[PDB]
């Protein structure tokens, strides 16, 4: 369920 710029605006949170 990997996070990218599409799901969140926070760079820290991307896999």
């Amino acid at each position, epitope marked *: 369920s990997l996070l990218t*710029e*599409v799901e*969140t*605006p*926070i*760079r820290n949170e991307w896999g």
Partner: antibody
Amino acid sequence: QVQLQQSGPEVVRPGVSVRISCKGSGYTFTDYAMHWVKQSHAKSLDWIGVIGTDNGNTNYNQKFKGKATMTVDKSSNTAYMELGRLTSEDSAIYYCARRDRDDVWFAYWGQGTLVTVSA
Amino acid sequence: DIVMSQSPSSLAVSVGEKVSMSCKSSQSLFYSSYQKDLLAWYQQKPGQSPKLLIYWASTRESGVPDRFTGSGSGTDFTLTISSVKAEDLAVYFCQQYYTYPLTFGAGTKLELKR
């Protein structure tokens, strides 16, 4: 020399759709998503949504669900936004924009595309 | 959605004045992992796209004059111009990037007092 180059102005009849483009040059296209922003004349800015340039996945502001579609042609470094079934509320300048190297603040903007909805 | 409230909507200024404008978010924008607030400011003039001024609440973008200062943490943010110049007449917007959808304030427009 990051540049976001948008398509030119559009006059579109009510009830039809319009396809606008944003070509990213001077950088690695797939390393940054493309965001789109509406500015109604004399108004504020509204974020429409984001498309991953690498994965093609999208995330729309629920305010624009079913109004806006986003696509990308990676081979062309071009992102496209389709605005559907236009009404006079859709008349505005539309920008593409992208982040710098960190979180999603907009360091680079296209020059905007003017959409005027009229018969 | 995170509501960004800017005030005043318009401000009449005089060259050389210190100018202050407010941006309040309906939720905290503080992000612990960075120890920064996820807030940016923009300047926009007629006929142009917005230009980035400040990010993480207080870092000036390169090339932005040092008379622009961003401050605040949590919900209550301020953009200060220490000594306003005529070239600073524009609309200023704030934006949060804590979460989607991204959201902007309605702007503060600087006009000249007479």
